[PDB]
Amino acid sequence: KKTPPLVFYWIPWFGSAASYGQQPYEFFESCRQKYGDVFSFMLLGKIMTVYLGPKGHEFVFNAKLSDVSAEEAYKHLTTPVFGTGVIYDCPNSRLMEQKKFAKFALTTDSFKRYVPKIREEILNYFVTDESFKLKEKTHGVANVMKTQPEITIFTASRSLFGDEMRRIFDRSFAQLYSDLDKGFTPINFVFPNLPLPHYWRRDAAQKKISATYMKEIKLRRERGDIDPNRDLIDSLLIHSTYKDGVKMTDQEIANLLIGILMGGQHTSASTSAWFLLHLGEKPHLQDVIYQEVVELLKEKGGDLNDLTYEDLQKLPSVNNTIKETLRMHMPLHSIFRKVTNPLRIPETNYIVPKGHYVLVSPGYAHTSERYFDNPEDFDPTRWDTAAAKANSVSFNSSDEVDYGFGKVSKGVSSPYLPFGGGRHRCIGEQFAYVQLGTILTTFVYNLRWTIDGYKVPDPDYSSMVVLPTEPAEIIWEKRETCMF
Ligand code: HEM
Ligand SMILES: O[C@@](Cn1cnnn1)(c1ccc(F)cc1F)C(F)(F)c1ccc(-c2ccc(OCC(F)(F)F)cc2)cn1
């Protein structure tokens, strides 16, 4: 009957890019107050159709394969970074199965092993990195936009790839990852390939790192066994065959490893950076966690080195802090699909034309007064309440569906959806919690920190993930239990 209201703009190309780009949530809210929950806005020559709130979550996440395409929207963002033939550079059925393959490395039995490895890496960083140097220093300053991206790549690599990779992680591979990371930008939506050096370094890093992985894949296939059913490389060695019998090439497997690492490390880097800062602003929250962790280990007759995956299950303060950080700082502010066939928006007369892009934003709801009281207050204790819990469950469907990587909720109508929903749902949620939880406990047990200001930095929405604005540091002291 009707196409959704288009948000007025003056600049013929730019559209609403400036405002949407600077502050996505504010922009959405201004648009909502004028037009309602469903509106369109022009962006770099593309028409973005937004559906705010839980009903929007349903509309986009649970949209039919035949109606919208995620790979149409993401191809240019990721393919040049990860490599060809995986993730968005393949049909959806291939993606579904790749997710299934990777999930075999993301189970409890693996996690139980990952935890000490992830802690060890953190501890090594504490001793060797100039931010900490805990054997020499007693006070210090940590730029969390340096420490967290680095710790996250060390812990994730050690965990998912194993010790060998950790072993070869010298400064040469450091440059590559930096060269590749620098190529992982929203600029790829607009400029995926250019002949200025930055791209050259990126393409070259992709080839080099994937080759490295390929070598390790082949080497392990032949001889390797550090320990049983350890990791992601083990998993893909075994689980590399599609349902039609087609098998991933070792180059494709390598490329999938890059995707998984890059996504996981980024989302985790930002999340840990954010909860270090927010905890700095509110140091008493640190002491709560500390108290909980220390009592727990006292029960146990142990020290931090005794802290297990199972222990992480007994620490609600840790897991509430991560929830709250993902509420206030979802790493993805926007999630796109391309409209491939005219969508009718149920409970309306609107029709979304083919060629539009549909945009869903759980972050909006996360940070909206409509769903969360005092949304801009960082309070992990809200997750012990009914209201918050109610915001985490989907009213309409408690039934579950399997898209090919295991059963997920059919219902996505929850205001709080940090890990998305439906077909393209995250598979890294539990791993993220294991990694972030270990990071958080290892920090809190050894250190206490504050921030210089009275406020956490403003978020930067121009990055691949929502990162803290550039000056972002914590000032740390040692806790009586500091291991060094
Ligand atoms: C705080 C941590 C993380 C957050 C907040 C997060 C968030 C998300 C979100 C919102 C999506 C849905 C994207 C969409 O619909 O377009 C997603 C998908 C995904 N995430 Fe994550 N993620 C996190 C960590 C990880 C980790 C650690 C891994 C890997 C181990 C991972 C791998 C994936 C994969 C494979 C997808 C699926 C993409 C698709 O099917 O199209 N994520 N993640
Ligand atoms: O969804 C990602 C990120 N992710 C999710 N979980 N972990 N990582 C992703 C998915 C699967 C992967 F294997 C690797 C990935 F990194 C992704 F595909 F790249 C992804 C897609 C979209 C976005 C994104 C979406 C919207 C953005 O807005 C910036 C703009 F407004 F355009 F300026 C900026 C970034 C970021 N990463």
From TrEMBL:
PROSITE patterns from the UniProt entry: CYTOCHROME_P450
CDD domains per the UniProt record, alphabetical: CYP51-like
List of residues binding heme: C426
Keywords (A to Z) from UniProt: Heme, Iron, Membrane, Metal-binding, Methyltransferase, Monooxygenase, Oxidoreductase, Transferase, Transmembrane, Transmembrane helix
EC number(s) reported in the record: 1.14.14.154
Cell location: Membrane
GO cellular component entries: membrane
Domain of life: Eukaryota
BP term (GO), one: methylation
Reaction(s) catalysed by this chain's protein: 32-oxolanosterol + reduced [NADPH--hemoprotein reductase] + O2 = 4,4-dimethyl-5alpha-cholesta-8,14,24-trien-3beta-ol + formate + oxidized [NADPH--hemoprotein reductase] + H2O + 2 H(+); a 14alpha-methyl steroid + reduced [NADPH--hemoprotein reductase] + O2 = a 14alpha-hydroxymethyl steroid + oxidized [NADPH--hemoprotein reductase] + H2O + H(+); 32-hydroxylanosterol + reduced [NADPH--hemoprotein reductase] + O2 = 32-oxolanosterol + oxidized [NADPH--hemoprotein reductase] + 2 H2O + H(+); lanosterol + reduced [NADPH--hemoprotein reductase] + O2 = 32-hydroxylanosterol + oxidized [NADPH--hemoprotein reductase] + H2O + H(+)
Ranges annotated as spanning the membrane: 4-21
Gene Ontology MF: a single term: sterol 14-demethylase activity
Pathway field: Steroid biosynthesis; zymosterol biosynthesis; zymosterol from lanosterol: step 1/6
Required cofactor(s): heme
Enzyme class: oxidoreductase
Similarity comment: Belongs to the cytochrome P450 family.
PANTHER family for this protein: 24-HYDROXYCHOLESTEROL 7-ALPHA-HYDROXYLASE (PTHR24304:SF2), CYTOCHROME P450 FAMILY 7 (PTHR24304)
Protein name per the record: Lanosterol 14-alpha demethylase
Lineage: Eukaryota, Fungi, Dikarya, Ascomycota, Saccharomycotina
Gene that produces this protein: ERG11
